[PDB]
Amino acid sequence: VKEVTQNEGTKTIANNLTSTIQVFTDSEYQLPYVLGSAHQGCLPPFPADVFMIPQYGYLTLNNGSQAVGRSSFYCLEYFPSQMLRTGNNFQFTYTFEDVPFHSS
Amino acid sequence: GADGVGSSSGNWHCDSTWLGDRVITTSTRTWALPTYNNHLYKQISNGTSGGATNDNTYFGYSTPWGYFDFNRFHCHFSPRDWQRLINNNWGFRPKRLSFKLFNIQVKEVTQNEGTKTIANNLTSTIQVFTDSEYQLPYVLGSAHQGCLPPFPADVFMIPQYGYLTLNNGSQAVGRSSFYCLEYFPSQMLRTGNNFQFTYTFEDVPFHSSYAHSQSLDRLMNPLIDQYLYYLSRTQTTGGTANTQTLGFSQGGPNTMANQAKNWLPGPCYRQQRVSTTTGQNNNSNFAWTAGTKYHLNGRNSLANPGIAMATHKDDEERFFPSNGILIFGKQNAARDNADYSDVMLTSEEEIKTTNPVATEEYGIVADNLQQQNTAPQIGTVNSQGALPGMVWQNRDVYLQGPIWAKIPHTDGNFHPSPLMGGFGLKHPPPQILIKNTPVPADPPTTFNQSKLNSFITQYSTGQVSVEIEWELQKENSKRWNPEIQYTSNYYKSTSVDFAVNTEGVYSEPRPIGTRYLTRNL
Amino acid sequence: PLMGGFGLKHPPPQILIKNTPVPADPPTTFNQSKLNSFITQYSTGQVSVEIE
Numbered sequence: 001v002k003e004v005t006q007n008e009g010t011k012t013i014a015n016n017l018t019s020t021i022q023v024f025t026d027s028e029y030q031l032p033y034v035l036g037s038a039h040q041g042c043l044p045p046f047p048a049d050v051f052m053i054p055q056y057g058y059l060t061l062n063n064g065s066q067a068v069g070r071s072s073f074y075c076l077e078y079f080p081s082q083m084l085r086t087g088n089n090f091q092f093t094y095t096f097e098d099v100p101f102h103s104s
Numbered sequence: 105g106a107d108g109v110g111s112s113s114g115n116w117h118c119d120s121t122w123l124g125d126r127v128i129t130t131s132t133r134t135w136a137l138p139t140y141n142n143h144l145y146k147q148i149s150n151g152t153s154g155g156a157t158n159d160n161t162y163f164g165y166s167t168p169w170g171y172f173d174f175n176r177f178h179c180h181f182s183p184r185d186w187q188r189l190i191n192n193n194w195g196f197r198p199k200r201l202s203f204k205l206f207n208i209q210v211k212e213v214t215q216n217e218g219t220k221t222i223a224n225n226l227t228s229t230i231q232v233f234t235d236s237e238y239q240l241p242y243v244l245g246s247a248h249q250g251c252l253p254p255f256p257a258d259v260f261m262i263p264q265y266g267y268l269t270l271n272n273g274s275q276a277v278g279r280s281s282f283y284c285l286e287y288f289p290s291q292m293l294r295t296g297n298n299f300q301f302t303y304t305f306e307d308v309p310f311h312s313s314y315a316h317s318q319s320l321d322r323l324m325n326p327l328i329d330q331y332l333y334y335l336s337r338t339q340t341t342g343g344t345a346n347t348q349t350l351g352f353s354q355g356g357p358n359t360m361a362n363q364a365k366n367w368l369p370g371p372c373y374r375q376q377r378v379s380t381t382t383g384q385n386n387n388s389n390f391a392w393t394a395g396t397k398y399h400l401n402g403r404n405s406l407a408n409p410g411i412a413m414a415t416h417k418d419d420e421e422r423f424f425p426s427n428g429i430l431i432f433g434k435q436n437a438a439r440d441n442a443d444y445s446d447v448m449l450t451s452e453e454e455i456k457t458t459n460p461v462a463t464e465e466y467g468i469v470a471d472n473l474q475q476q477n478t479a480p481q482i483g484t485v486n487s488q489g490a491l492p493g494m495v496w497q498n499r500d501v502y503l504q505g506p507i508w509a510k511i512p513h514t515d516g517n518f519h520p521s522p523l524m525g526g527f528g529l530k531h532p533p534p535q536i537l538i539k540n541t542p543v544p545a546d547p548p549t550t551f552n553q554s555k556l557n558s559f560i561t562q563y564s565t566g567q568v569s570v571e572i573e574w575e576l577q578k579e580n581s582k583r584w585n586p587e588i589q590y591t592s593n594y595y596k597s598t599s600v601d602f603a604v605n606t607e608g609v610y611s612e613p614r615p616i617g618t619r620y621l622t623r624n625l
Numbered sequence: 626p627l628m629g630g631f632g633l634k635h636p637p638p639q640i641l642i643k644n645t646p647v648p649a650d651p652p653t654t655f656n657q658s659k660l661n662s663f664i665t666q667y668s669t670g671q672v673s674v675e676i677e
Contacts, residue, residue, distance in 0.1 A: 087110025
């Protein structure tokens with residue numbers, strides 16, 4: 001985790017050892033599921049590339065540019081998540097449900 | 105297991121769990137604690153020497169410390185959760201809470217000419233303690249700003265701790281007490297440490313959330329007459345000259361105002377009435393003069409709100425008592441002289457059944473002693489204390505309102521329920537104090553007795569978690585027709601209610617009372 | 626799915642990540658408004674995914 005500052009024209013980047021990041025997975029599917037629309041930003045095909053993580057956003061019911069009564073709002077800080085500093089790691093496992101073979 | 109600068113102290117938790125009669129609400133926020141008063145205690149005072157009137161004089165101290173205040177409901181409940189609660193349940197009370205403080209960073213900032221720069225200080229500490237013996241002035245429960253934000257994505261600033269003591273004018277008397285907060289055992293934490301404690305509420309009556317489907321005077325059977333009598337006639341009728349005589353009647357369906365009744369409405373201490381329509385109000389400034397005040401120690405104090413009363417009677421909604429209600433501000437409301445459209449008026453109208461209207465008299469009594477010579481006279485009761493056989497309802501709690509208050513420690517009290525609403529507690533949740541440990545700048549090379557006034561500009565941030573277990577009282581009712589519920593508006597809108605706007609500002613459209621479901625008296 | 630793939634009732638859970646905000650120097654006098662000033666910050670690391 002690094003912190004960059006701007007002083008006049010100079011740019012400088014230095015480690016921040018005490019900062020954290022927050023990570024969680026929705027295993028109960030309680031959020032709008034935004035994968036599967038073929039958006040850009042997946043992992044690169046070629047392992048030597050460094051990539052940028054995309055921003056999360058979602059859409060809800062609308063009438064014109066306005067919103068209706070059923071429109072829902074989700075606050076992502078409202079889920080239990082794990083906080084990691086530079087000495088921590090995160091992992092989980094998953095098991096697919098039975099699915100028919102893709103016929104090739 | 106093993107703590108250090110590389111490991112994280114604790115994990116984020118915001119969740120609500122509904123099991124049976126329990127609901128467990130946990131929350132987490134990010135805070136930032138500045139250095140106050142340059143690490144100094146200070147005597148603060150105000151007196152009539154200036155323009156201040158004798159009523160606003162005070163004497164007290166302002167500490168460098170700072171404290172956590174979670175006392176408001178919306179800290180612990182999302183609006184959706186608040187809706188599950190008030191729609192399905194009669195009452196609730198807290199059981200036990202937990203508190204955690206972790207992931208502490210301490211940073212030091214320096215000024216060199218025009219440049220500002222901020223860098224971690226790994227070795228600095230903070231000091232934390234709780235007063236569990238209640239040996240400090242308990243400053244929570246006055247509804248001060250600075251609680252946790254309603255919306256979890258907000259970072260908030262911890263308020264400064266200070267207290268007031270006995271005064272005469274701007275001066276202090278002999279009984280005035282001074283407390284040094286460094287004089288308590290506290291825990292000192294560096295960036296690899298965390299802090300926690302638990303607490304268990306004492307038995308407290310459920311907060312009643314419901315409206316009465318009946319009214320106090322209508323408990324009678326409409327079909328049947330009473331066997332008791334009342335005095336219905338003092339004089340003959342139909343004659344050209346009528347003479348005094350006595351006659352009696354039984355209360356019945358036709359006249360229900362005359363029937364005997366077992367119970368009386370709650371106490372009444374009158375408020376002045378104000379109309380939301382400006383034109384109807386008198387033209388003058390009566391706010392402070394015509395207000396309803398109580399006089400204590402030669403010092404007039406406005407009574408805000410006062411004891412619980414119905415805001416208005418039927419179709420009076422445009423009227424509200426002067427100071428007798430809670431008034432919450434809308435987002436981005438001005439601090440002073442805010443317009444009517446910038447504030448939100450709560451309404452106690454639900455309790456009309458049990459309690460008298462705030463702006464009207466309690467009743468009528470006999471002033472004089474009648475005779476054949478002299479006519480009887482009547483008089484009005486503006487203020488009425490407690491009488492045997494009174495029943496009343498407390499004031500409603502709101503999603504923005506305070507949860508509890510500390511019952512003062514005194515010889516005696518009467519129904520000790522805080523007027524602002526909440527749970528009165530002999531032993532409230534202990535208040536938590538926190539401070540940056542001062543780090544001196546370079547001392548001189550030659551010894552000097554005077555204390556060191558130079559310090560390193562410094563502040564700290566971190567996480568805080570609070571978890572409260574609530575007990576519920578299930579709603580068991582045979583009512584046939586549908587209840588009134590709280591519901592969001594179905595019609596379209598520019599922006600969603602209880603959600604961020606284009607600019608990212610979170611806002612609350614209206615206050616939300618707790619009384620929807622109904623019961624019989 | 627029309628784009629091709631495996632339809633799933635319970636797909637792999639989606640994973641969310643964020644930098645924890647670190648405030649800049651707060652004022653010395655208390656103010657209720659939320660803190661809008663932060664330290665410009667970003668994080669990097671490694672990620673591994675393994676499918677059987």
